[PDB]
Design a protein around this ligand. Sequence first.
Ligand SMILES: [Mg+2]
Ligand SMILES: [Mg+2]
Ligand SMILES: [Mg+2]
Ligand SMILES: [Mg+2]
Ligand SMILES: [Mg+2]
Ligand SMILES: [Mg+2]
Ligand SMILES: [Mg+2]
Ligand SMILES: [Mg+2]
Ligand SMILES: [Mg+2]
Ligand SMILES: [Mg+2]
Ligand SMILES: [Mg+2]
Ligand SMILES: [Mg+2]
Ligand SMILES: [Mg+2]
Ligand SMILES: [Mg+2]
Ligand SMILES: [Mg+2]
Ligand SMILES: [Mg+2]
Ligand SMILES: [Mg+2]
Ligand SMILES: [Mg+2]
Ligand SMILES: [Mg+2]
Ligand SMILES: [Mg+2]
Ligand SMILES: [Mg+2]
Ligand SMILES: [Mg+2]
Ligand SMILES: [Mg+2]
Ligand SMILES: [Mg+2]
Ligand SMILES: [Mg+2]
Ligand SMILES: [Mg+2]
Ligand SMILES: [Mg+2]
Ligand SMILES: [Mg+2]
Ligand SMILES: [Mg+2]
Ligand SMILES: [Mg+2]
Ligand SMILES: [Mg+2]
Ligand SMILES: [Mg+2]
Ligand SMILES: [Mg+2]
Ligand SMILES: [Mg+2]
Ligand SMILES: [Mg+2]
Lengths: 64, 209
Amino acid sequence: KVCYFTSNGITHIDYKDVELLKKFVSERGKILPRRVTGTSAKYQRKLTVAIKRSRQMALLPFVA
Amino acid sequence: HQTRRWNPKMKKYIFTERNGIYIIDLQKTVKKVDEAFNFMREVASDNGTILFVGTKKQAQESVRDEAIRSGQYFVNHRWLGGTLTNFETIQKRIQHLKKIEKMEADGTFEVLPKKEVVLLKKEQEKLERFLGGIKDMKGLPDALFIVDPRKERIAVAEARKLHIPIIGIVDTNCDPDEIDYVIPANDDAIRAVKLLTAKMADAIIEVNQ
RNA sequence: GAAGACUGGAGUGCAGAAGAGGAGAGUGGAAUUCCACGUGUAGCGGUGAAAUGCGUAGAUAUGUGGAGGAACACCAGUGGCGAAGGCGACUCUCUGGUCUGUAACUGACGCUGAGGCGCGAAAGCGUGGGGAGCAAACAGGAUUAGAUACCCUGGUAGUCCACGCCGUAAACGAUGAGUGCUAAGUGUUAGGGGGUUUCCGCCCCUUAGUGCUGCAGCUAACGCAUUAAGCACUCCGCCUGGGGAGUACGACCGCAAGGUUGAAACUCAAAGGAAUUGACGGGGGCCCGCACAAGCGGUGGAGCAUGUGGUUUAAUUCGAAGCAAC
RNA sequence: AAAUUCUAA
Ligand SMILES: [Mg+2]
Ligand SMILES: [Mg+2]
Ligand SMILES: [Mg+2]
Ligand SMILES: [Mg+2]
Ligand SMILES: [Mg+2]
Ligand SMILES: [Mg+2]
Ligand SMILES: [Mg+2]
Ligand SMILES: [Mg+2]
Ligand SMILES: [Mg+2]
Ligand SMILES: [Mg+2]
Ligand SMILES: [Mg+2]
Ligand SMILES: [Mg+2]
Ligand SMILES: [Mg+2]
Ligand SMILES: [Mg+2]
Ligand SMILES: [Mg+2]
Ligand SMILES: [Mg+2]
Ligand SMILES: [Mg+2]
Ligand SMILES: [Mg+2]
Ligand SMILES: [Mg+2]
Ligand SMILES: [Mg+2]
Ligand SMILES: [Mg+2]
Ligand SMILES: [Mg+2]
Ligand SMILES: [Mg+2]
Ligand SMILES: [Mg+2]
Ligand SMILES: [Mg+2]
Ligand SMILES: [Mg+2]
Ligand SMILES: [Mg+2]
Ligand SMILES: [Mg+2]
Ligand SMILES: [Mg+2]
Ligand SMILES: [Mg+2]
Ligand SMILES: [Mg+2]
Ligand SMILES: [Mg+2]
Ligand SMILES: [Mg+2]
Ligand SMILES: [Mg+2]
Ligand SMILES: [Mg+2]
C-alpha cells in the first residue's frame, strides 16, 4: 500500500545491503512482484538491478 | 451530483466547487424559477392542463400530493411508453378501466364463478397502479413537468416528438436542451422537489383561479 | 526581386531525467545430452489402443565428478527504446537519439521530396569453423477403403559464429510526412510548478508518450472520435470491372534461386464491402422426454410357434428394409 | 487439455 523507498526515504539501493534485499526476495529465492510489495517504478527497476548484481556476487542464492 | 458524472453543457450553471461535488449558483436559479412561474401563469389559464411526471420516489410522493392539491393530471409509477403517442390505445385501456369499475361497483359484484379474485382483481389493481392520473386526462397535455430529466428520457422524447413545451428541474447530470425551458435544481433531496413542485402548482392555481 | 527590422517556427548554450537503442571484449546460474564411478534389479519409453525403439554385455531411477552447445526462469506490466525490420542474464569500453525546465545566444537557417545513396524478420547462396536440443528431405511403426499426412521411435542440411551476397512478408494501425483548430470522464510511464504539512502523505495545475469509454462531426455500414477515419493548407506515392497475369517480349540487378519495370489477343456480365433473418456445425450454454442413476422382471443360454436374408425347387405370390420394416 | 476413423452422390 506504500512504497518503502518513498516512506522510509532511501535514495538508491546499493547491492551490499543484504538485509535490505530480504524484504523483497521470496524465501524460495526469487524477486517478489511489484504488487505484493507495492514498490514504485524507478525503485522497482533499480532494486531488481541491485538484486541481480548481488546474486551474481554469490551474495544471495540463485535457488534455495 | 459528483464532479465525475456531469454534463459539460451545464458549465454555465455551476459555481465554484466544494470538496466532493459541484455547487450550483443560486441567482441564476431564482431568475429561472421566476421565469418559470411567469410561464406557468401564462399557460395555466387556458382551460387546458399541466402534466406531472414523478420519476423518482421523492418526485413520486411530491407530484402525487401536488397534483391532488391542484386537481391536475399526473403520472406517478413507471411511465409506460406511448401515452403521448399511442393515445388511442391508452384511451382504450382507460375506457376498459372505467367500464370494469362501473360494472363491479354497480351491477352484480358476482359474475358467475369464483374467478374474480384470480385475475379480474389483480389485473385491475395493476392497471390502476400504472395509469393513475390518466383516467381523467381528456385531451393532450400542454406542458409536462419532470423532476429528473435524465431518468425520464422516454417521456421527454415522446413530448419533443409531438412538440409541446417542457418544464423541469435539471441537475448537473443532464443535458439542458432536450427540455426547452429549464431551472437548475437538485433532483435528489425530497425537500427541494417538494418546494419547486408546490411553487409550480401554486402559480397554476393563482393564475387559473 | 532588392535593402533593413522582429521572435511566437528551427537550431545552439545552461540545469536535470528515463530507457531490452547499436557495436566489441569478458564472466554467471538453472536445465537437456554425452562420458566415468558406487550399491542397484527387470523392465524403461510411448499412444485414443499398440508396435517400432532402449534393456541381463545389464538399461530407467539413483548420488558424485568432467565436456560441450544453445537460450536467458522470477523481475514482466495494452511497461520502455528505435525511422522501420526489431531489441530481455551480468560487467566494462566505443557510441546514436529523445523528454522536461530557464531565456543566455543566432535570427525564417523551415516542410515535402521524382531520380539517387543506405538499412531491411525468416527462409536461401559462396568460403571456413563449429554442432547440446529441435528438425525440411529420409527410414521404420501405427491409423484408414487408400494415407506420398496428422500420431510414435530415430535423423541429414539448417538453426549458432566471422566475412561477403540476396532484397522479400498479413514488412499491418491493412491508416504517407509537416503544421494549426474543435465537449468531456478515467488508468499508466518520464518530468515541472503550488498548497496542508517538523517530516510522511494527500489535493490542484502544466508538458511529452501510452490505453479504455464518449459528445459535435464524419461513414454504405461496421465504426473513428485531441494518438480523428472531424474542419483546413503544402508536398509525395498510388487506383479506374474480374480473369488472361504479376504471365509473355524488352531492359537492369544477382554466383544461382530469383527481384524491380511490365502489356495485348481472347473471354465473362458480373467479381466485390458492411449487416439482415433463416438454415447448418464432427462450437458452446440452459431446459425436457423411462435418457441415463436405483430397483423389479425379462431377452441372448435349451425346447417350441410365427416373421425375416440366404436356400432349392416349377413357383416357393407381390410389397414394407437403422430408431420410424420383421 | 486429454481423446480412433467415418455421404457418397
Ligand atoms: Mg440529481
Ligand atoms: Mg524553441
Ligand atoms: Mg551441468
Ligand atoms: Mg534425444
Ligand atoms: Mg545416471
Ligand atoms: Mg551430475
Ligand atoms: Mg518512435
Ligand atoms: Mg519482435
Ligand atoms: Mg520518450
Ligand atoms: Mg526513390
Ligand atoms: Mg537466417
Ligand atoms: Mg551457411
Ligand atoms: Mg511485423
Ligand atoms: Mg507510428
Ligand atoms: Mg501494402
Ligand atoms: Mg491521406
Ligand atoms: Mg522524412
Ligand atoms: Mg496528416
Ligand atoms: Mg495520460
Ligand atoms: Mg508521475
Ligand atoms: Mg496523452
Ligand atoms: Mg454518435
Ligand atoms: Mg477502437
Ligand atoms: Mg472511440
Ligand atoms: Mg491510432
Ligand atoms: Mg499507435
Ligand atoms: Mg474516410
Ligand atoms: Mg482487364
Ligand atoms: Mg506494378
Ligand atoms: Mg478481399
Ligand atoms: Mg460477409
Ligand atoms: Mg441393479
Ligand atoms: Mg433361444
Ligand atoms: Mg440354441
Ligand atoms: Mg410390387
